[PDB]
Structures are given as structure tokens and as C-alpha cells.
A and B are shown apart, each in its own frame.
Chain A
Amino acid sequence: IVGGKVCPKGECPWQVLLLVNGAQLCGGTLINTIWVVSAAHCFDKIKNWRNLIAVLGEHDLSEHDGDEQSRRVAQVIIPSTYVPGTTNHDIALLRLHQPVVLTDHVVPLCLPERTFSERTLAFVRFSLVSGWGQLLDRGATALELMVLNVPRLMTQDCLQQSRSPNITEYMFCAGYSDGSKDSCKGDSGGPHATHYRGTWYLTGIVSWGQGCATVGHFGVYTRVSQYIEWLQKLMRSEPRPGVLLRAPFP
């Protein structure tokens, strides 16, 4: 995250850190005690599906404070329409091997209904994006969880205000074209969270962009409203052997 601030410990309680062999991979969002939403592209280069770990309640990567909860990732579910090394349909649903325990520091973000998200949340101007990604383009990643308030654009406006892949109906733009403020690659998979009347909801996933906080370019986020029924159906399904699952979309 470029141009944000430290998320005070406990104020981003849905944030997930994904690790592979102890190394930071991506962010994600807790939506229930066993389910995490992240980005499909986080998984394009995974060799051993069995060393993926999700951490909840993380804040400062330099220390252990006893609020962290680590779980193995039992299932990574990606829509059939996602093609590795391309941008569209950039979403993954992760099943943890055992539930996390909800605490002051570990709380799910609400997965909204489709209609509510399309008719109401999509018009809330500002939303928060968070992660342990790069603090600067070509810079080090953050040790403390960072958060940034970003404004959402209508896609026609994003295209006009920008100066490369299509921005599809499964995506939306948010952020700033002046190079000051953005999410960046190490924030991939993390939440774009939208407040409405006292409650926060999942509206986007950190997905792609040009460089990092690059002048002339906004961040691109997966439009989670397109996937609500796909996610809900999968959350009612039994687990299957083998970590990766490709599931039909729609």
C-alpha cells in the first residue's frame, strides 16, 4: 500500500496474510470462520499446494503477540473462466482446514447480497484497501498492516481519466491517477471494504494495475458482486480431495 497509514491493530480484523513456505504471498479476506476470499492470480505459480498457510489476526510481521491464528489452506477454488496469466475473473475462494476462532482481532467481513452490492454499495464513493505490500514502487514491503481510503470510478470514467487489458464487467477501478496512493502487487488478494450504515462489506479484491502507484493509472479490483451466488453455492458444497478446484462459472 502506497500513501496510506498503519491500520491500527484490530481495526482490519478480516485481513488475511497468505504464506507459502513462510514467505508472504498475498492478502485475503475472511468472510466466515472457514472461508477466505483472495485473488486467483495469487496461485498461478504454486508448486506444492500443501504449504499454503493463512494467518488471521496478524498485524506486525516482526513479532508474535498471541492474537495470530494460522491455518492450513484445505481448498483453493477458482472460477473456470479464469485463465492463468490473464486478468479477468481474478477471484479465489479458500477453505481453511479448521475454523478460526473469532476474537477482537479476528472477525469476518460481510459478504453482501448481489442486489445490495449493485444497487447500494457500488455507489459508496470511498472504500478501504489494505495489505502488507510495497510502501513504494520498487520499494520494500510493509512490516505493519497498512490501509488506504480509495474512491471508486465508473469504468467509462476510468477509461477517460487514464493514460493494456480491458476493464471488464468483472472489474472496477479505484484510487488516484497522480501516483500518490495505490495498492500494489504484494497487496494482491486483499480486501476492498465498503462501509454502509455502520457495517463493512466486501466489494473488491486487489487484482491488477500498471507498475505501482503509476501516474496516469488507477488500481483495478475484482468486482465481487458478480460472484456472490458463485461463492455462496461453493460455501454449501462438500470439500473434495486435491487442494485446487476449478468450479464452473457462472
Chain B
Amino acid sequence: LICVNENGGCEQYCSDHTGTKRSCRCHEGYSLLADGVSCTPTVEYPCGKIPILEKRNA
């Protein structure tokens, strides 16, 4: 996986490393799941999410 294709499979941010290596990362207010790709909120009001809609699906 390389970050230029399909975002490296990352939900959010992606860094290429020497080798066939890639590390996904998450914005502040999120943490990376054990899949190495997914980001889940760690705070009540993470950036870029709409509370009234996130509760309309909670």
C-alpha cells in the first residue's frame, strides 16, 4: 500500500515509509483502531462531524 492510491486504505492521513510500509494516522480528537486504518472519535465534538446527524444515526 502507498498513500497516493486509494489513500493507502487509510480513513484519514497516510505516511509512506521505506519498504512496502505505510502508517495511517488520525486527526486530533480521534484514535486509530487495530485495523491500522480506521479512526474513531475520542472527544465529544471531534472536528468535521455534525452532532445532530451523528445522533440521528447513533
Contacts and interface: CB of A to CB of B under 8 A. Distances in A.
B14 interface: yes
6 contacts: A11-B53, A107-B50, A109-B48, A110-B47, A116-B12, A116-B13
Contacts of A65: none
B51 A115 contact: no
A31 B28 CA distance: 12
A104 B48 contact: no
Interface string B1-45: 001100100011110000000000001000000000001000011
A108 interface: yes
The range of chain B's interface size is: 10 to 19
A231 to B, nearest CB: 14
B22 to A, nearest CB: 12
The range of chain A's interface size is: 20 to 34
Interface in A93-109: 102-104, 107-109
A197 interface: yes
A110 B14 contact: no
Contacts of B7: 116, 119-120, 196
A165 interface: no
B45 A199 contact: no
A10 interface: yes
